[PDB]
Design a protein around this ligand. Structure first.
Ligand SMILES: CNc1nc(C)c(-c2nc(Nc3cccc(O)c3)ncc2C#N)s1
Lengths: 296, 255
């Protein structure tokens, strides 16, 4: 393996298992993102995250999923070559703090994100780390799912999977309650939080801990009962001592949102994972009837 | 809920991840018998480390695909298998055993360096295509077609399907979805006298007619199981964990 054809331009960031650079193919002129993965050649070998990220990403070709272009093998290093995108959604949100993201673009971005996610779920893949940092946009008005290092192929029906999943703020209630089983619904929850965040200009549930996180959700959507969430009381980390907060008027939760927007959001943030709306089903929601593709 | 899209996709992928049916004849130094020994051992390893059955199924698939394109000497067969089990664990397990544990299980036959290097070679050979559909994956879907779920049926189906892993001849010529089909019906018929249900006929497009060849092979494997050289699977399914389904008697006929 050889990277002689790639010229490094500047660094994009790190992740723990992989360092990321913006690079240029010297022969074709193509700009790419290079993810460098150190192999633990004297101890643990190839990291399980890399194994999953690569095997799964190879199956997923879709307009709204970042493209893995090549994998370059070295005895000691793995280089993932991704198509390059100009910016992530988190940084775009910071740049849009003063003016906010136009609703037509928010709608477009959410629509595209659901298309990407639906493809994932259609192909038995859970992302499990959906957050603005992992969503990439270009100059054309496209947005794509990225960073599949926490993803995994699920089964029908699911088994118990890794409990330590999803960045805290975007983590579904069932996970916080220590559910024996979780599935596609956890990804939808994350997009829900992200939808709300694009609108309000701040995280919906910025928890400082697992219990804070869970309580922030309770104080907004109301504390779930066996009526609203069949089985909640029987969840491993559920406790009867949980304070019982009343549900807030969605009108307040996310003011700028219309009737359909609030409708969609409420279904994406439904407590019962069984009732929580799917990516596929979400795409057919009235809110997208007039969707367009603006440029940032 | 994607249950249909997923099934359709898996049906597509099981063809692409399919091992070369007659590869063993092109392996100068290894045979079906050695493979059977290797797989039987991986069953034990799975038991020893409480790995998922799916991990076992994945490892076998990696092995058959590796041996489809790579000639291997008998002395290195276990190394391939150990690395395949390592990769399957990493892909599928929440808590994979560490490499040292995989070295230890080979009773000092190979070094850690060898295991690690074989891991990378296996990955290169499979071009990182590790998300293979397994007999186990189809079975679990098929199970959702019960009313209610019968614990013995499921366990006995998992048992039969697992037995198929041991014997390249004749099971390499059957797709996982088909093997799962025969296993589910055979288990069901043994436990409740019931047959391949209509809802599954509609889902899979498979009928008892189409499943016949595999089913006749599977029935014979079931009947002759107690005399098979490899016995790890039967011993494993004696446990209450699987409701001792391996102690049940195979039907004499299927009709
Ligand atoms: C987890 N986030 C990242 N992983 C990869 C490999 C990255 C990536 N980056 C860009 N461009 C870019 C530019 C500015 C900020 C930023 O976060 C990204 N394009 C594609 C990928 C991929 N895959 S960063």
């Amino acid at each position: 393996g050889s990277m002689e054809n790639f010229q490094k331009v500047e660094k994009i960031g790190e992740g723990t298992y992989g360092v990321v650079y913006k690079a240029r193919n010297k022969l074709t002129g193509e700009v790419v993102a290079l993810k460098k993965i150190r192999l633990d050649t004297e101890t643990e070998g190839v990291p399980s995250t890399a194994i999953r990220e690569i095997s799964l990403l190879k199956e997923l070709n879709h307009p709204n999923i970042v493209k893995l272009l090549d994998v370059i093998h070295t005895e000691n290093k793995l280089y993932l070559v991704f198509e390059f995108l100009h910016q992530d959604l988190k940084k775009f949100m910071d740049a849009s703090a003063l003016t906010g993201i136009p609703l037509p673009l928010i709608k477009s971005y959410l629509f595209q994100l659901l298309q990407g996610l639906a493809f994932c779920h259609s192909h038995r893949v859970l992302h499990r780390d959906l957050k603005p940092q992992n969503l990439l946009i270009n100059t054309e008005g496209a947005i794509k799912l990225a960073d599949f290092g926490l993803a995994r192929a699920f089964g029908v029906p699911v088994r118990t999977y890794t409990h330590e999943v999803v960045t805290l703020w975007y983590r579904a209630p069932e996970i916080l309650l220590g559910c024996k089983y979780y599935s596609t619904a956890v990804d939808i929850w994350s997009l829900g939080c992200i939808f709300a965040e694009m609108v309000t200009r701040r995280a919906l549930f910025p928890g400082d801990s697992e219990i804070d996180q869970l309580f922030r959700i309770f104080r907004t959507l109301g504390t779930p009962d066996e009526v609203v969430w069949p089985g909640v009381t029987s969840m491993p980390d559920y406790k009867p001592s949980f304070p019982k907060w009343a549900r807030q008027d969605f009108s307040k939760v996310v003011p700028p949102l219309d009737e359909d927007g609030r409708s969609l959001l409420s279904q994406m943030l439904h407590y019962d994972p069984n009732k929580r709306i799917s990516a596929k089903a979400a795409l057919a929601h009235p809110f997208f009837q007039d969707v367009t593709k603006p440029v940032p | 809920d994607y249950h249909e899209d997923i099934h359709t996709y898996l049906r597509e992928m099981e063809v692409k991840c399919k091992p070369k049916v007659g590869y063993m004849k092109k392996q100068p130094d290894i045979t079906n018998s050695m493979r059977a020994i290797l797989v039987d051992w991986l069953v034990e390893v799975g038991e020893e480390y409480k790995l998922q059955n799916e991990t076992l199924h994945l490892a076998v698939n990696y092995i058959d695909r590796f041996l489809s394109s790579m000639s291997v000497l008998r002395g290195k067969l276990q190394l391939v298998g150990t690395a395949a089990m390592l990769l399957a664990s990493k892909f599928e397990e929440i808590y994979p055993p560490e490499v040292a544990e995989f070295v230890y299980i080979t009773d000092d036959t190979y070094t850690k360096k060898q295991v690690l290097r074989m891991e990378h070679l296996v990955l290169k050979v499979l071009t990182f295509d590790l998300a293979a559909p397994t007999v186990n994956q189809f079975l679990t879907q098929y199970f959702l077609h019960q009313q209610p779920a019968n614990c013995k049926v499921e366990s006995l189906a998992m048992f039969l399907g697992e037995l198929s892993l041991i014997d390249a001849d004749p099971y390499l010529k059957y797709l996982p979805s088909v093997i799962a089909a025969a296993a589910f019906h055979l288990a069901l018929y043994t436990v409740t006298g019931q047959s391949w249900p209509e809802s599954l006929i509609r889902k899979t497009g498979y009928t008892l007619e189409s499943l016949k060849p595999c089913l006749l092979d599977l029935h014979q494997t079931y009947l002759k199981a107690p005399q098979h050289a490899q016995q790890s699977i039967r011993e494993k399914y004696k446990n209450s964990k699987y409701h001792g389904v391996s102690l049940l008697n195979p039907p004499e006929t299927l009709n």
